[PDB]
Amino acid sequence: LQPKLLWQWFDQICAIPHPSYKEEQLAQFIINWAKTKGFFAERDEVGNVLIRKPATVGMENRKPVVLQAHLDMVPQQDPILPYIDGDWVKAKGTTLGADNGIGMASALAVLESNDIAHPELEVLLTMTEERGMEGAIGLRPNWLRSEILINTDTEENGEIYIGCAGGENADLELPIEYQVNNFEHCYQVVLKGLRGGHSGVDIHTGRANAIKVLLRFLAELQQNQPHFDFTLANIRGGSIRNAIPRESVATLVFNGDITVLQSAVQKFADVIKAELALTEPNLIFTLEKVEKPQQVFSSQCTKNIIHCLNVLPNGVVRNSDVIENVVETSLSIGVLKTEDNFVRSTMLVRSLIESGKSYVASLLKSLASLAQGNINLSGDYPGWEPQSHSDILDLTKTIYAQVLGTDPEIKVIHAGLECGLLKKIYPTIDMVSIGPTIRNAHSPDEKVHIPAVETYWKVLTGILAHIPSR
């Protein structure tokens, strides 16, 4: 499969298990390989790989360039088995690692080659992008000699990213008080079959959050059906902080006829189907009898947990006025769990601007106070603000338009790239992000468009061939 060097590298990248905390084997393999070619190869304290290669003949007075990619991939320690589908490539029943392995392979392909024009070259392969961007955060400053950085972590052909959102984890704990269970019945209200998505790139859509839809039901039920005597026994939903939840469950104990609960579920199921129709075709509520616990939440605890999580802000907080068709600030709750004595909600706050993040954090701290819970903030990273001017963008646009035959789109993404952290440590470096079309990253649905990788290559190499004088 062409281009040989890129794909032979990707094939090799797949062979070495390299999930988001087992990066060593790949990191060491790459360092070793670099040294056998006579390339400078180093790792910083945090473990970021830096390789260097001199300018090609005739390219010596031209601005030095670092191609940057992240080492790790999402596992959602044994090797990856890929295959060619049609015009696509995918891993056998798992995440492929096209994010960010194709970018990385292309950077090494350039290093390996002897017939690609490029200036003085760095290749920076960062640690742990996918779990709190530890590499980018602890990158050694005054280390890179490059004046230009080409981040290869964008995932859409014909698009050049010049910006991205920053992020921050927020965890809400709400206390659980229990009572002895003396209720006649125990059933789970089960919600399933939602689309899901990536809580950044898909937050703009009309897609629904399963945790929030269940909480909507329970709030309405408690509000409108005061003679339905029940309390929660437990409650949960979702899987991962930055994924839109697709399943949720609440265990309910109650007195009286099961049919009362059944009817409430039905009427709500029918309402929500009317509302979501095209957007959530597979949404299903079920009502499933379960073993009766010895202890359950107190009635007051139930009301506090239901009403808190129903009011809980979720989704688009603000759309951008400055940039076109971009969410400025959002948040999403990806996991809900009932632990000993607390109910835990796991959220990712996103914004292009720092003050949008802090504002959401203010909202959550207001909610927690009303509800006598607590917010824990962690994992804060800065966004990537579009530069006022960029020479590398000018060139990247010129080349992309030559290769495609139509103009490319210049955008900022409502998700996390490392560029904000990198520009934090290297403010004078002119930065851009590109990359071929990769679908459904972070998930076992991960596909990479074959011809987009070729177009990407021609654009990459085209840019490298034409970097201007210092």
Can you say which residues are annotated as belonging to the binding site? 70, 99, 129-130, 153, 442
Instruction: Name the residue nearer to a second copy (CB basis): 70 or 207.
Output: 207
Least CB distance to Zn ion at residue 152 (A): 9
Tokens of 374: 């607590």
Least CB distance to Zn ion at residue 416 (A): 8
User: Could you tell me which residues come within 8 angstroms of residue 351 by beta carbon, excluding any fewer than 6 positions away?
Assistant: 165, 166, 317, 328, 329, 330, 357, 360, 383
- As a whole number of Å, the end-to-end CA separation of the chain is 36
- The C-alpha atoms of residue 330 and residue 165 are separated, in whole angstroms, by 10
Verify cis geometry, omega within 30 degrees of 0, for the bond prior to 3: yes
* 155 scored as a contact of Zn ion (CB under 5 A): no
Instruction: Name the residue nearer to a second copy (CB basis): 173 or 454.
Output: 173
Instruction: Name the residue nearer to Zn ion (CB basis): 51 or 98.
Output: 98
- The answer to whether 117 touches 59, Cβ cutoff 8 Å, is yes
Binding site feature residues for Zn(2+): 70, 99, 129-130, 153, 442
Verify cis geometry, omega within 30 degrees of 0, for the bond prior to 142: no
Least CB distance to Zn ion at residue 99 (A): 4
Gaps in the chain with C–N over 2.5 Å, residue before each: 76
- The answer to whether 467 touches 117, Cβ cutoff 8 Å, is no
Alpha-helical (H) ranges within 196-257 are 210-224
Regarding beta strands 315-319 and 248-254, do their DSSP bridges make them parallel or antiparallel, or are they unpaired?
unpaired
Of 129, 147, 155, 430, which residue is the catalytic one? 129
303 binds, among a second copy, Zn ion, none (CB under 5 to 8 A by kind): a second copy
Count of residues that bind Zn ion according to CB under 5 A? 3
DSSP string, 381-409: E--BPPPS--HHHHHHHHHHHHHHSSPPE
State the DSSP code for 279: T
- The answer to whether 189 touches 215, Cβ cutoff 8 Å, is no
User: Could you tell me which residues come within 8 angstroms of residue 325 by beta carbon, excluding any fewer than 6 positions away?
Assistant: none
* 99 scored as a contact of Zn ion (CB under 5 A): yes
367 binds, among a second copy, Zn ion, none (CB under 5 to 8 A by kind): a second copy
- The answer to whether 346 touches 331, Cβ cutoff 8 Å, is no
* 430 scored as a contact of Zn ion (CB under 5 A): no
100 binds, among Zn ion, a second copy, none (CB under 5 to 8 A by kind): Zn ion
Tokens of 201: 């790139």
Instruction: Name the residue nearer to Zn ion (CB basis): 99 or 147.
Output: 99
* 156 scored as a contact of Zn ion (CB under 5 A): no
278 binds, among Zn ion, a second copy, none (CB under 5 to 8 A by kind): a second copy
- The C-alpha atoms of residue 157 and residue 165 are separated, in whole angstroms, by 20
Binding site for a second copy (CB under 8 A): 206, 216, 219-220, 223, 271, 274-279, 303-304, 306-308, 310-311, 313, 316, 318-319, 321-322, 353, 355-356, 358-359, 362-363, 365-367, 369-371
Is 354 one of the annotated active-site residues of the chain? no
- The answer to whether 381 touches 421, Cβ cutoff 8 Å, is yes
363 binds, among Zn ion, a second copy, none (CB under 5 to 8 A by kind): a second copy
402 binds, among Zn ion, a second copy, none (CB under 5 to 8 A by kind): none
* Amino acid at residue number 175: P
Least CB distance to a second copy at residue 210 (A): 16
* 20 scored as a contact of Zn ion (CB under 5 A): no
Of 23, 72, 147, 430, which residue is the catalytic one? 72
Place of tokens 């980018």: 136
* 153 scored as a contact of Zn ion (CB under 5 A): yes
* 437 scored as a contact of Zn ion (CB under 5 A): no
Instruction: Name the residue nearer to a second copy (CB basis): 91 or 261.
Output: 261
Instruction: Name the residue nearer to Zn ion (CB basis): 48 or 100.
Output: 100
Is 72 one of the annotated active-site residues of the chain? yes
- The answer to whether 26 touches 16, Cβ cutoff 8 Å, is yes
Least CB distance to Zn ion at residue 217 (A): 32
Least CB distance to a second copy at residue 60 (A): 43
Residues in contact with Zn ion by CB under 5 A are 99-100, 153
Catalytic site residues? 72, 129
